Subunit: 196 residues, 6 copies
């Protein structure tokens, strides 16, 4: 019967949100965790052990894998999902201590609205900034043959990627998820400002 203290903590955090934002934003978080943790994490398993190059030079497969992939795609999407969830965990931990100082005062407007807007504003800056770095570094597809011009390799060599079509399907799936997540946070910002 000690679960009624959890119903008060969920009510204070979701006090300024709309009725349809509590539903579509929480199920989209579970969609992001299960898809990234089960399906897309194992396609990127043999990303280096199946990368091959057409050369005899020792040391040319180490430096040509590293020029193609400066950071992996599944470790760029894990860093992305933490930065967008930190302003929610920071604001949820802030309400818990505010409700504690006042609970031990009754037994013995304008403050919690400003900190709600700054947390929603930073979840949208982090979503746009991580989409522009990927558009600049990689793009939104993958080709099968790479052409490498590093050292110690002589002139130019041809190198071949591992599963370049299955990975392109999951790059476009994670683009639509982050564009729907960005559009639901802008609706949250518009409803608070245009109300009062």
């Amino acid at each position: 019967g000690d679960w009624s203290a959890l119903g008060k903590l969920l009510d204070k955090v979701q006090a300024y949100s709309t009725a349809g934002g509590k539903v579509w934003l929480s199920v989209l978080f579970i969609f992001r965790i299960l898809l990234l943790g089960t399906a897309v994490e194992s396609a990127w398993g043999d990303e280096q052990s199946a990368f091959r190059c057409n050369t005899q030079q020792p040391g040319c497969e180490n430096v040509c894998y590293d020029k193609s992939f400066p950071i992996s795609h599944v470790r760029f999407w894990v860093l992305q999902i933490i930065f967008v969830s930190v302003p929610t965990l920071l604001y949820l931990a802030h309400v818990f201590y505010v409700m504690r100082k006042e609970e031990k005062l009754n037994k013995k407007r304008g403050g919690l609205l400003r900190t709600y807007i700054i947390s929603i504003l930073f979840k949208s800056i982090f979503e746009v900034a991580f989409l522009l770095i990927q558009w600049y570094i990689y793009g939104f597809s993958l080709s099968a043959v790479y052409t490498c011009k590093r050292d110690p390799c002589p002139h130019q060599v041809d190198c071949f990627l591992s599963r370049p079509t299955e990975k392109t399907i999951f790059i476009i799936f994670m683009l639509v998820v982050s564009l729907v997540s960005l559009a639901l946070n802008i609706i949250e910002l518009f409803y608070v400002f245009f109300k009062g």
Copy 2:
């Protein structure tokens, strides 16, 4: 003794369903999870490391595995089981907030029936649409010898698959499960419309 609040939430969600649909649709969900997570997930383990081709050309096994399998079968069935379960989780989260706004009103018809029909209708569209893509791309069997005509391979080569008979048994098992699941949702749509 705090488990009697769970009996009220299960009663509201299953208010418009028949007596025999609550049984056959929930045990078929557990049948889908245990079969996919234990038996069929490990047959697809060495799908690329045991794919061989009859050539000396460097880079011909990378591009001929990718032409045969644009997406794996076990990652197409994980994406399928999430899309069919999202309209159930969206409707279950909608009833929880509707029962909350009314509970804090009594202590201090036509709305929940329309949203039930749209959730059942989308679980049947997602089952038919995922069956037509697999019929167009793959079929419903697998052969042992593949013939590949990509580049950099010269003319045509012969490539050999890993366990093509054991995988054909599990392709037909997952076809019958999705055809029984589609037939139980059409009976649900017919009982609601022909009642009132």
Copy 3:
């Protein structure tokens, strides 16, 4: 103190069973799960990576492993243990809803006996049918040298199996478990019919 509602659900399911069938049939289920999940699952680990053949032909080890093993033994025993446990989970979910419709009627013979006999009858049909398929396809032992006559292999080749003696010990262990499980369900059918 909310565990006394579980004692009522266990009493209704086991109302038509004998006194000694509640003990010997539940410990035999745990014996089947722990033996299959710990001991026999890891002997079948390198079943393909240690299969060798005496040839130089590319593609002859792929097609001669697949002719020998159309389905693995540990994935045939996982499919077997689900089919025999589905009529128990279907009948246990049926009693839970029958006790719910009557509980909300008292606060605001001939039906549950017919569905008990049909569930016990289907656990014995599924045990006999899975034993006859294995007797027809495989047998109840394994030999060390296999002789293969598929294509692209020339004439006939010799192929060698991985651990053929340790696997034969566990084939006979899982045969005696399914013959004791079949004999305890026939005693259950004989006691219900010859009582009344």
Copy 4:
């Protein structure tokens, strides 16, 4: 506060045991599980992939590993620990139903002593029978060089084992554990018979 129903079930099972047998027999069970599950299970990891033989014949390493090891040592000790724990789980499940038929009779000598002696007698028969099979098949040490005379190998070959000294240390550790466990069950049989 619903944990006081567990204190009654533990008191009925341990009613005929001595004061010092409840302590030394339960901690020795945890010693057997943690040692077998953590330390000895990973020494037997590369038991086949590091077995080598001094030959060029294809198929001679498959048949000479199998002649040396008809069953592995870590899968013979998992089968041993289940057979000795089954008479304890069968007797513990028997007391739970006997206390149930009598509890629903008071709210609406000579029987449980005979079944206690038969369960202790079978834990000692299973400990002696598993020690005599290992003395006949293997012994209680391991040598480094094996000499194999099977087919298709020509005449006799030399084969070399993986970690034969570290495995000999753990064979003697599991011998002393099963000899102390056998001696504590004979003291239990002597105290019940010589009391009354």
Copy 5:
């Protein structure tokens, strides 16, 4: 309802801290655990099996990997996160016993402030000392080609690293986390001394 004894233990430990140090220091601990346990732990997987050298000498890849990496980066960051968390667990276990001796005295200033300052002072000494060892041994980047002059290698050889650019991104991420963590503990020391 037995969770109200946890609210008293959390209040005594955080009695001398500021209002904004309870929030920013606890979420930064979770940021350190999830980033180190999911993203950076798997980039360091094939650190030795993909290290290559341009030589034919047997034994030159063993001694040139060991000269480059005297201790791995992911095992130096696990040792770092335990040493900084030990003074928090030592002080939290000290308050629990102090509240116990006084609770069994009421039912049948200057002591807990000195031990709080010494625990905060040791979390800052351990953060600075682990940053100076890494600056002396490694630096804060990684290059792609290493030049090795050990024995048995003849003269000098060239050796090539595995993913030297992706690892450099995560070295700088874990530097900023430990510099923000060091700056939040110095603010804690300044607020206690300048208050009273």
Copy 6:
């Protein structure tokens, strides 16, 4: 609210200990488990698959790894941590039954002090005995080149170890932990004897 029966069992076990031994001995147990289970367990992963020797003789790497390492270092430290924790689990299980026989006597000095001293005395004998075996067999460092003179190897060969410097850092970390743990148990023996 059923957690107040755990506060009585913890009070009886720690009745003869000092105030500062309850803190420093329990956090040092958690330091031993997390360090051994996370950091040092994975450095010893490729201990045999990266051991190389400068020979062409078949069977010389099997017998020269086994002469160098008669038992691994991480399996000698798991056996060590169980033997030192068995006298604590034996004494904790002894107090639980002594408090049971007396609880069912009140509702329907000199005994528990002798058994406390014998349990502390055996935790110090097991710590000294495991340190002397390692000093005799191995030492407290590891060198990079080993010289082997077994059979079937001709004359003498050179063999090379895997990570001999990172392992030497963790050998000295586990030496200081067992010397601090031995010094805290001797202080416990001195305080009981010199009190009364």
